[PDB]
């Protein structure tokens, strides 16, 4: 695989070559792959290879990364979340979004 | 996503934003998501987003979290288990 605009990777704290989970809101499929960086400003989300059996152009997905850390750090951890609307327009907050 | 009454999270040692497995006793589906806190005393189990394709209102589920530790500690480790009946009433 999945190629993602590098601006989107930076907003979520996801690295190139990191394991990611994709949860498809449209068709309900759930799969794991790895992240590839697409050109900054391209707004691309491209499912490549075997992953093209699990998503289609126009599907709405959630892309997540998971890390490990000790219990005391986990209890004060806050994840990096980015929210999207329209033409993959990114917001910092869920306030602006229609639906 | 899965929003869970914070009293339930406290009893099982599950944290907000932790990875959880959900095993659906009613329909047999098995999936992985993360935990969000719901209001204490609400007795809510809510499946949000893509996960709403894997469970319906009234399904019976088991929710589990896993941790890693050295073999020597694992040999005496004891998990936190909470048991439920009726309308999400904790025994």
């Amino acid at each position: 695989x999945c190629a993602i605009d590098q601006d989107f990777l930076d907003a979520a704290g996801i690295l190139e070559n990191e394991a990611i989970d994709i949860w498809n809101v449209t068709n309900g499929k759930r799969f794991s792959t790895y992240a590839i960086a697409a050109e900054r400003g391209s707004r691309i989300i491209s499912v490549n290879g075997a992953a093209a059996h699990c998503a289609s152009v126009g599907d709405i997905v959630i892309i997540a990364s998971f890390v490990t850390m000790p219990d005391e750090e986990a209890r004060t951890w806050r994840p990096n979340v980015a929210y999207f609307e329209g033409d993959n327009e990114m917001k910092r907050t869920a306030k602006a979004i229609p639906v | 996503x899965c929003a869970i009454d914070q009293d339930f999270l406290d009893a099982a040692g599950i944290l907000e934003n932790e990875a959880i497995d959900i095993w659906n006793v009613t329909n047999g589906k098995r999936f992985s998501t993360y935990a969000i806190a719901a209001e204490r005393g609400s007795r809510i189990i809510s499946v949000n987003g893509a996960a709403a394709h894997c469970a319906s209102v009234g399904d019976i589920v088991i929710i589990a979290s896993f941790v890693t530790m050295p073999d020597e500690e694992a040999r005496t480790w004891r998990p936190n288990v909470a048991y439920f009946e009726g309308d999400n009433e904790m025994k």
Partner: peptide
Amino acid sequence: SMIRTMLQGKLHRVKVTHADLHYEG
């Protein structure tokens, strides 16, 4: 040196009370 994956905790036989495809958080 050898690290195990162990059950931390579980909620046994809870019921789903709500299901929302359209959630934003």
